[PDB]
Design an enzyme around this catalytic site. Structure first.
Site, PDB file in Angstrom:
ATOM      1  N   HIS A   1      -3.882   5.408  -2.644  1.00 39.27           N
ATOM      2  CA  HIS A   1      -3.891   5.117  -1.221  1.00 39.27           C
ATOM      3  C   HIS A   1      -5.334   5.345  -0.805  1.00 39.27           C
ATOM      4  O   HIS A   1      -6.056   6.098  -1.451  1.00 39.27           O
ATOM      5  CB  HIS A   1      -2.951   6.086  -0.497  1.00 39.27           C
TER       6      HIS A   1
ATOM      7  N   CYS B   1       0.212   9.994   7.018  1.00 40.54           N
ATOM      8  CA  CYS B   1      -1.024   9.258   6.849  1.00 40.54           C
ATOM      9  C   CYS B   1      -1.613   9.263   8.251  1.00 40.54           C
ATOM     10  O   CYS B   1      -0.878   9.104   9.233  1.00 40.54           O
ATOM     11  CB  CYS B   1      -0.743   7.829   6.389  1.00 40.54           C
TER      12      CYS B   1
ATOM     13  N   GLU C   1       0.850  -1.172   0.000  1.00 33.06           N
ATOM     14  CA  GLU C   1       0.000   0.000   0.000  1.00 33.06           C
ATOM     15  C   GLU C   1       0.895   1.234   0.000  1.00 33.06           C
ATOM     16  O   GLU C   1       1.506   1.562   1.005  1.00 33.06           O
ATOM     17  CB  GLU C   1      -0.925  -0.050   1.219  1.00 33.06           C
ATOM     18  N   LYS C   2       0.954   1.903  -1.142  1.00 35.19           N
ATOM     19  CA  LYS C   2       1.793   3.103  -1.381  1.00 35.19           C
ATOM     20  C   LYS C   2       1.588   4.268  -0.369  1.00 35.19           C
ATOM     21  O   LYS C   2       0.522   4.863  -0.275  1.00 35.19           O
ATOM     22  CB  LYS C   2       1.519   3.595  -2.803  1.00 35.19           C
ATOM     23  N   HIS C   3       2.667   4.593   0.348  1.00 36.86           N
ATOM     24  CA  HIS C   3       2.690   5.709   1.297  1.00 36.86           C
ATOM     25  C   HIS C   3       3.840   6.642   0.910  1.00 36.86           C
ATOM     26  O   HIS C   3       3.756   7.859   1.074  1.00 36.86           O
ATOM     27  CB  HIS C   3       2.926   5.216   2.728  1.00 36.86           C
TER      28      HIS C   3
ATOM     29  N   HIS D   1      -9.215   6.963   6.940  1.00 39.82           N
ATOM     30  CA  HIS D   1      -7.899   6.636   6.445  1.00 39.82           C
ATOM     31  C   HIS D   1      -7.586   7.484   5.226  1.00 39.82           C
ATOM     32  O   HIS D   1      -8.253   7.391   4.182  1.00 39.82           O
ATOM     33  CB  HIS D   1      -7.848   5.155   6.092  1.00 39.82           C
TER      34      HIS D   1
ATOM     35  N   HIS E   1      -0.988   5.549   9.577  1.00 38.59           N
ATOM     36  CA  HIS E   1       0.294   4.891   9.342  1.00 38.59           C
ATOM     37  C   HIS E   1       1.514   5.792   9.525  1.00 38.59           C
ATOM     38  O   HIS E   1       2.620   5.457   9.091  1.00 38.59           O
ATOM     39  CB  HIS E   1       0.311   4.259   7.953  1.00 38.59           C
TER      40      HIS E   1
HETATM   41 FE   LIG Z   1      -2.273   4.593   5.187  1.00 41.12          FE
END
Ligand SMILES: [Fe+3]
Ligand SMILES: [Fe+3]
Ligand SMILES: [Fe+3]
Ligand SMILES: [Fe+3]
Lengths: 115, 115, 113, 113
Positions: D39, D100, D12-14, D45, D103
């Site tokens: 994302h 994020c 999952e691209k951050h 989120h 995250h």
């Molecule tokens: Fe995230």
């Protein structure tokens, strides 16, 4: 009130009123907000355009919604231009508003119809 | 006009208007701003008070000056309270303004005389 | 990268001090820079902001609780000091990240008992 | 402290992407998160902001050029992508710091030739 202090028309010499230009391919809108893009507004540690907020007010809508907020945080070198591009998706029509701040010349606003 | 969307009066059953309390000792000013200190405003990821900005408009002054901006960035756990304290030095008298934003109910404002 | 630029000490106090009080779940946190030895506060040199993070125990990531910007540096003089309020029953670590317009990023941490 | 919480893996691209265009001193910089692989973008989120720093080769500290907040996550859906513009005749390194809400912090860098 504070809203009374929000200007929407420049006075000759300096330029403050934010310019809102958009591009729209279906649901995704591309918006450019700026101040003094042609006739630059001063940009020094003592005098500058600090930030620009972008609001979207959908038709049949009670409140404007803040889409984003961009900050031009350095005014020497690098010299951050009070110019930015935002990206957002929506399937509604309405108007876009731009609120900008000059550290010594207060708040300024403008608008454009999101057709 | 976005300016006209700014509200200064609450509607029954939800606090939005920011409260401004200050304490000045000499040139030192302490400012507490908040939304729904006694009767809380909803604070969830979907609905909350996102931020409050504090402006100071000195007398014999043309423009309000942004003193500070605080952002309440989480809304689960921890639950960030839409309440904060600012500190600034000034020898001028004037009016203080609070501009707050609810992510679904827009912009709100209030003022207090800085004696 | 960027983390390597993040300092912890002095040069002129830059290290953000974290102080908190707890009343049940409510944590009152005061963050500040140069509260004893004032940092320069002028248009050319100043502390611009501070971010307060909470890294709960039994949590993989730090959560941004609040961010504060000290936007005027003449008159009025926004002192680089603020107080936040947030509710939480958890315990963990509080991080404070401050930024000087000419001296970059500074961090600090304290245990939230 | 905070340093250790900043990732650059792949959640999952951050990891924030940095792309730029140069025309003399004028640098056009576009920062984004997950333009290829989107994302999540919901009230619970989402990527909240990105900060763009410039660390000149002959400078000891990184300078915050700009910062951007993506404030709505229903409809409109502010996409975590923005374009900045700054003037500078110097060369060096560009950093992007994205956050994020569940995250934490993420970073990346690109050489500004
Ligand atoms: Fe995230
Ligand atoms: Fe101006
Ligand atoms: Fe509300
Ligand atoms: Fe400094």
């Amino acid at each position: 009130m504070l809203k009374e202090t929000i200007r929407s028309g420049d006075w000759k010499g300096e330029k403050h009123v934010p310019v809102i230009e958009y591009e729209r391919e279906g649901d995704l809108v591309k918006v450019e907000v700026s101040v003094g893009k042609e006739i630059p507004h001063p940009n020094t540690p003592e005098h500058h355009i600090a930030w620009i907020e972008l609001y979207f007010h959908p038709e049949g809508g009670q409140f404007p919604i803040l889409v984003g907020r961009v900050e031009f945080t350095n005014h020497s070198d690098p010299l951050t231009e009070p110019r930015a591009v935002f990206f957002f998706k929506t399937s509604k029509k309405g108007k876009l508003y731009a609120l900008s701040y000059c550290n010594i010349h207060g708040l300024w606003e403008n608008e454009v119809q999101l057709e």
